[PDB]
Amino acid sequence: MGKFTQRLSLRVRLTLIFLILASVTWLLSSFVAWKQTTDNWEYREDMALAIVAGQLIPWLVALPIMLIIMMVLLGRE
């Protein structure tokens, strides 16, 4: 497998998607754990308009990342 040899943001395909997918899942978990309060099994914790934003933030950024991951293989995203 490659990616590590190239280490230029992105280059390979299929592997990077899985890697990022796992990274996103882990990130989401870390985010869920990263609870905020004051100043500036579980699954669905009682919250008004925060959990959605927390989940959305990484999603909005991850979405393009995935596209870029796949696009990089073509030549450029």
Give the torsion sign (CA, 58, 60, 65, 67).
Answer: positive
**How many alpha carbons fall within 13 Å on the CB side of residue 17?**
8
Cβ neighbours for 13, distance < 8 A, ≥ 6 positions apart? 69, 70, 72, 73
Q: Could you tell me the end-to-end alpha-carbon distance of the chain, in angstroms, rounded to an integer?
A: 22
CA gap 17, 31 in Å, rounded: 20
Determined by which method? NMR
CB atoms within 10 A of CB 69: 24
**Burial label, 58 (beta-carbon count in 10 A; 0-12, 13-18, 19+):** middle
Q: Give yes or no for a contact between 62 and 24, defined as CB atoms under 8 angstroms apart.
A: yes
Angle CA(28)–CA(34)–CA(36) in degrees, nearest 5? 130
Q: Residues, the chain, total?
A: 77
Q: How many CB atoms are located within 10 Å of the residue 16 CB?
A: 21
